[PDB]
């Protein structure tokens, strides 16, 4: 097909989901160790006493 000289310029670009928030959860301080560890730490406490 034929084209005119361009009427608008552009280039390929990247669109992004700009913001994120991610405010931490309340009980977030229990995340370095997994649930499975935190539950096995109460079974060991009950079994050592």
């Amino acid at each position: 097909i034929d084209f005119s000289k361009p009427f608008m310029s552009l280039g390929i670009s990247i669109m992004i989901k700009k913001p994120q928030k991610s405010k931490p959860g309340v009980f977030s301080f229990l995340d370095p160790l997994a649930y499975e560890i935190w539950m096995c730490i109460v079974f060991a406490y009950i079994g050592v006493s």
């Binding site: 079974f43 060991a44 009950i46």
Partner: protein, 53 residues
């Protein structure tokens, strides 16, 4: 499965404790069996969790 066996033997001790009275060493057996049963359970939970992962 060890835990069911122990918790059962602990039950046998509490039953016997009635007929063979004045043999207190059967209540200690009961208590130890039940405590040992809990300890078997902890290992069987750790093993289970560790394995499936």
């Amino acid at each position: 499965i060890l835990s069911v066996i122990l918790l059962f033997m602990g039950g046998l001790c509490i039953a016997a404790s009635e007929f063979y009275k004045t043999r207190h060493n059967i209540i200690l057996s009961a208590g130890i069996f039940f405590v040992s049963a809990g300890l078997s359970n902890i290992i069987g939970i750790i093993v289970y969790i560790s394995a499936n992962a």
